[PDB]
Each structure stands twice: as C-alpha cells, then as structure tokens.
Amino acid sequence: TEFIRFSGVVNPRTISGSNSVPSTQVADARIEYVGNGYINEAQNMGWLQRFFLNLSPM
Amino acid sequence: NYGYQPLFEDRRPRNIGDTLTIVLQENVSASKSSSANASRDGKTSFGFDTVPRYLQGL
C-alpha cells in the first residue's frame, strides 16, 4: 500500500479555470509519498548497519 | 470582509499572511590564482693549456 499525502495553503487567485493549481504555488507545502509491505521493508537499513553508519569511526 | 482590493493593480502581498512565489535561481562563481618564480644560473672557467716560459711563474 502506497500513500500520497499533501497539505498546504492556497491563494484563491492562483487557482486556474479548471480548478487546478501547481504545487509550487502552495505556501506551506507538505508532500509525502510512502509505502508499506515487504517492498518498503526491503528499503530499510538493518539495525546493525544503521548503528555502524552512525557510530563507526569512518 | 477582506477590505479594499484594487481592481487593475497586480496582485501583490500587502499584509501579514499573504503568499509570494520565490524563484530560487542562484549562480555564484569566484576564482583566484597566482604564481611566482625566480632562476639564476652561473658558470665560469679559465684554463691555461700551454703556458709560455715567461708566464710560467704566474
């Protein structure tokens, strides 16, 4: 399952005639595109590898 | 009521909370370089292969 979430503030005069506004005209734009399932877990680092990436000398 | 709104004037932000689009276009490039050099070569020689008798002592 994939989730696309959007939030922001829109000026009414930036909305086009077809009730559309580009995402670059939204003030506090919060855009999120995430997923779950084993596909999403396959894109997470292992805990040991994350620990090393954060605490290894090099 | 949202107050007085000009008819023909371009839509500009005027009060707190108004939105404005910033087109981020930055291109900065600075450079500097310098060098210096100095050289000096000197060779000198003198040889008397055959010395006449009256010059021998010298």
Please name the residues between 7 and 46 in chain B that touch chain A, using a CB distance below 8 Å.
11, 19, 21
Token pair listed for A35: 């997923």
Chain A residues with CB under 8 Å of B11 CB are 13
Helix (H, G, I), strand (E, B) or coil at B55: helix
**Are B19 and A27 within 8 A, CB to CB?**
yes
Helix (H, G, I), strand (E, B) or coil at A53: helix
Q: Does the CB of B5 have a partner CB in chain A at under 8 Å?
A: no
The rounded distance, in Å, linking the Cα atoms of B17 and A11 is 11
**Cα–Cα separations (whole angstroms), residue A12 to A38, A45, B4, B22:** 41, 43, 16, 18
Q: Are A35 and A1 in contact (CB under 8 A)?
A: yes
Angstrom resolution of this structure: 2.8
Helix (H, G, I), strand (E, B) or coil at A55: helix
Best mutation target, B19, B22, B24, to test chain A (most A CBs within 10 A): B19
The rounded distance, in Å, linking the Cα atoms of A55 and B9 is 58
B5: nearest Cα among A20, A45, A13: A13
DSSP string across A2-51: EEEEEE--B-GGGS-TTS---GGGBTT-EEEEEE-SHHHHTTS--HHHHH
